[PDB]
Design a protein around this nucleic acid. Structure first.
Ligand SMILES: [Cl-]
Ligand SMILES: [Cl-]
Ligand SMILES: [Cl-]
Ligand SMILES: [Cl-]
Ligand SMILES: [Cl-]
Ligand SMILES: [Cl-]
Ligand SMILES: [Cl-]
Ligand SMILES: [Cl-]
Ligand SMILES: [Mg+2]
Ligand SMILES: [Mg+2]
Ligand SMILES: [Mg+2]
Ligand SMILES: [Mg+2]
Ligand SMILES: [Mg+2]
Ligand SMILES: [Mg+2]
Ligand SMILES: [Mg+2]
Ligand SMILES: [Mg+2]
Ligand SMILES: [Mg+2]
Ligand SMILES: [Mg+2]
Ligand SMILES: [Mg+2]
Ligand code: NA
Ligand code: NA
Ligand code: NA
Ligand code: NA
Ligand code: NA
Ligand code: NA
Ligand code: NA
Ligand code: NA
Ligand code: NA
Ligand code: NA
Ligand code: NA
Ligand code: NA
Ligand code: NA
Ligand code: NA
Lengths: 142, 142, 147, 49
RNA sequence: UACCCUCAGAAGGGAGGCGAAAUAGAGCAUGAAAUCAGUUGGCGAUCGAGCGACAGGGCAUACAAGGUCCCUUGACGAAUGACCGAGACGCGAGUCUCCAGUAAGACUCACGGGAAGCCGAUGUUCUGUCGUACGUUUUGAAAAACGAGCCAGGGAGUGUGUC
RNA sequence: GCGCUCUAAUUGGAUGGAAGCAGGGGCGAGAGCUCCUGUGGACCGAUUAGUGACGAAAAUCCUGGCCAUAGUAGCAGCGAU
């Protein structure tokens, strides 16, 4: 009658108090957009980031208000870096074989988008039976 | 008419500037203020010079404009406007909620703020707004 | 060319289009804007009065240099685009024609939608010369709806 | 000689146009011009062994 | 692209037929940006200009791909760190001792309770802070120094020989 | 260290819908990676080792397209009104 996602969409990993504090930190602090200088002033200039090289550039010079310049002090904590917001580490999956070795508590799975409906169904279920969650599940009517 | 003044200040024999400074402060706190007897407010100094400063402000101008009030009504209000960010939303709001009246159009007497009263007994060098206005060429209607 | 930008319901609605018409595109925007919401019939009477000069079409966007017309309400400038107007009458004659051939009351139908679109480039022919200047080429959709 | 087969010449200053060699009103030869030569192209004289 | 209606009409349009698909209908695969029409959301005819960045408010939001978030209380608690009161000085503003490194104190968590446009995020707008593009030339560029109307695509350390 | 072309070895995806495109979600300080929906309708990757006509906001840069300019100038001036 209604649509319901296959799999363990509610499953949550188990993280050591530290990693949970760290994950929580990242989510709290966040980071600046880090978009290219003046991208919003000229259409031809895309949002993608390029270091400002102008000798007189206001950003390059760090004038307050002209945007944060990309630098290492902005990195996320080692422990959680790359972690999906749920806390899960992801594993790119293309076929059923790829599901082997994946710990359903530590990692969730993302099925390459290129995979077709047929091969998905196989994966989606076998994945669940292995205790693994699939971040991008098929929604069926039940 | 009809101004739900939260506060009514009596300018009679009071230093215009000092009053205006406090009226601004309060208006920037909502305090709907009304100033009374501006014709009788006073500013210290040597009359002859004081008048010059004001007389000049009237000559100053051009196509664009520089409207300067000659009535004590206006003189005082512009003095107040000068102490507020009347171009900013909140500033124009405070100013808008402040009015100067000639004489007292209310019932309640006005209250005198602290440190704004000039002691006529120990002060011979000062001027009355009305006197200034009479000089500026204003039409005495008070 | 264009395709209907709005969606209609065949049971309570008629359609009509104009293709590659060589006429001011700026005048069309005005007329459309002007006759939308009117009744196929009201529009016709209107447009004919415009072609006459008794009724002016409000020029709200393309009005540089245009002199003020007293009959314009809420606005000031306007003119009497008789070429563009004669072409809207064709669109209407057609929209109201299809209307009745479907058991509808064309004249009393509402102009739910009408919009002009510049299409450009006429395109030379085989045994035919080329386009002189860059005369605009207009397309215009119309959707009649039962009251 | 790809791109070089033309007598194109730049008009120089004076008409509010970049100094780009042109012929019949179309720019030619130089690398930044559509149909112009290829600056640093592949070469036969190169030893790929 | 037959048939029918309309039209001055081999035009065009409506209806219709073919095909998986006509938004594959003739310069007909896909169909970006600049840009145009219509329209939805936000703003708006008393108000100020590098168009934003970071904070924080309004309003707006189908699903999916993110799921957080608010308040009571409590635990932990770095630097910092009191009010009141008791006594004691100072012409005075005020200070000293004690109460006390106490109460307080960012982040984080636990119990109970709450939110589903609700939290993030996104669109627009409001407020605060800062802020006169970019690249180049230059001792010094927002410059009344030089370049560009806008967008897309194109556009500049390569080969041989020798050291 | 990220990205592009094509070669090889190893290994995968796709008409149960590839590339591309539009809008949207997640990750990375970032170059960028990835997912969802729509479109599309036939190709597309990953890792390693290679290859190079390999990355643009600029050059009065080139070519094409387009907007404002504007429903504006011109369609009068001539001894042939
Ligand atoms: Cl690093
Ligand atoms: Cl003046
Ligand atoms: Cl101000
Ligand atoms: Cl005195
Ligand atoms: Cl036009
Ligand atoms: Cl923490
Ligand atoms: Cl180099
Ligand atoms: Cl790196
Ligand atoms: Mg841009
Ligand atoms: Mg005119
Ligand atoms: Mg060539
Ligand atoms: Mg096509
Ligand atoms: Mg110099
Ligand atoms: Mg390019
Ligand atoms: Mg391999
Ligand atoms: Mg550059
Ligand atoms: Mg051009
Ligand atoms: Mg003009
Ligand atoms: Mg004659
Ligand atoms: Na004074
Ligand atoms: Na004046
Ligand atoms: Na206009
Ligand atoms: Na009128
Ligand atoms: Na009018
Ligand atoms: Na030649
Ligand atoms: Na030029
Ligand atoms: Na060779
Ligand atoms: Na907002
Ligand atoms: Na230069
Ligand atoms: Na500059
Ligand atoms: Na200057
Ligand atoms: Na131009
Ligand atoms: Na190159």
């Amino acid at each position: 009658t209604e649509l319901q996602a296959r799999g363990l969409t509610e499953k949550t990993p188990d993280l050591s108090d530290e990693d949970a504090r760290l994950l929580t930190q990242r989510h709290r602090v966040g980071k600046p957009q880090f978009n290219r200088q003046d991208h919003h002033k000229k259409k031809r200039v895309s949002t993608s980031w390029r270091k400002p090289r102008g000798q007189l550039s206001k950003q390059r010079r760090g004038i307050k208000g002209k945007g944060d310049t990309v630098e290492a002090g902005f990195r996320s904590p080692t422990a959680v870096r790359g972690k999906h917001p749920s806390g899960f580490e992801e594993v790119r999956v293309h076929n059923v074989d790829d599901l082997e070795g994946v710990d359903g508590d530590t990692e969730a799975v993302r099925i390459a988008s290129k995979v077709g409906a047929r091969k998905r169904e196989r994966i989606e279920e076998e994945a669940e039976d292995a205790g693994i969650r699939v971040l991008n599940p098929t929604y069926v009517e039940v | 008419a009809e101004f739900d003044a939260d506060v009514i200040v009596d300018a009679r024999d009071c230093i215009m500037g000092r009053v205006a400074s406090q009226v601004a402060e309060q208006a920037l706190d909502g305090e709907t203020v009304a100033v009374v007897n501006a014709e009788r407010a006073v500013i210290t100094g040597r009359e002859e010079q004081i008048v010059e400063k004001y007389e000049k402000r009237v000559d100053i101008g051009n196509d664009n404009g520089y409207f300067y009030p000659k009535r004590p009504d206006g003189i005082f209000k512009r003095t107040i406007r000068g102490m507020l960010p009347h171009k900013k939303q909140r500033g124009r709001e405070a100013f808008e909620s402040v009015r100067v009246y000639l004489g007292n159009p209310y019932d309640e007497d006005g209250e005198v703020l602290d440190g704004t009263s000039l002691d006529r007994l120990s002060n011979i060098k000062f001027v009355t707004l009305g006197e200034i206005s009479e000089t500026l060429g204003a039409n005495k209607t008070w | 060319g264009i395709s209907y930008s709005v969606e209609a319901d065949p049971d309570t609605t008629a359609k009509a289009m104009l293709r590659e018409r060589q006429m001011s595109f700026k005048h069309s925007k005005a007329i459309a804007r002007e006759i939308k919401g009117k009744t196929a019939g009201e529009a016709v009477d209107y447009l004919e009065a415009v072609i006459e000069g008794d009724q002016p079409v409000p020029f709200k966007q393309h009005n540089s240099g245009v002199g003020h017309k007293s009959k314009v309400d809420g606005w000031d400038a306007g003119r009497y685009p008789e070429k563009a107007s004669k072409a809207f009458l064709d669109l209407l004659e057609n929209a109201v024609g299809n209307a009745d051939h479907q058991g509808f009351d064309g004249e009393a139908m509402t102009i739910k939608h009408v919009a002009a679109h510049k299409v450009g480039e006429r395109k030379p022919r085989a045994m035919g010369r080329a386009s002189a200047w860059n005369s605009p080429q207009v397309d215009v959709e119309l959707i009649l709806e039962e009251p | 000689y790809a791109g070089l087969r033309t007598p194109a010449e730049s008009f120089g200053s004076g008409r509010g146009q970049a100094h780009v060699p042109k012929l019949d009103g179309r720019a030619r030869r130089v690398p930044q011009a559509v149909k112009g030569r290829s600056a640093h192209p592949p070469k036969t004289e190169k030893d790929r062994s």
